[PDB]
Amino acid sequence: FLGMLLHGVGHAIHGLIHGKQNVE
């Protein structure tokens, strides 16, 4: 399940970081 765990964690970091617009 190493690949499956990587897909879930990658989405959280990508979605949370890109969830808000980058300002300054």
TrEMBL record:
It is found in: Secreted. It comes from the Eukaryota. Belongs to the pleurocidin family. This is Piscidin. It comes from Oplegnathus fasciatus. The chain holds residues 23 to 46 of 70 of the full protein.
